[PDB]
Amino acid sequence: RVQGRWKVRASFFKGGGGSGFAWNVCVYRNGVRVCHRRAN
């Protein structure tokens, strides 16, 4: 169990690293192409 439960390491994000692929993810929502870019 993570003692820092309320901390959440996934909320820190020290970076992506050397690799930088898939900036935008294009999905299809009922025929609509939606390219979401999730970045922190």
Helix residue spans in the chain (DSSP H): none
Q: Identify the CA nearest to 25 among candidates 12, 36, 38.
A: 36
Q: Would residue 2 be called left, alpha or beta, if left means φ above 0 and alpha means ψ between -120 and 50 degrees?
A: beta
Q: Which residues contact 37 (CB under 8 A, 6 or more apart)?
A: 23, 24, 25
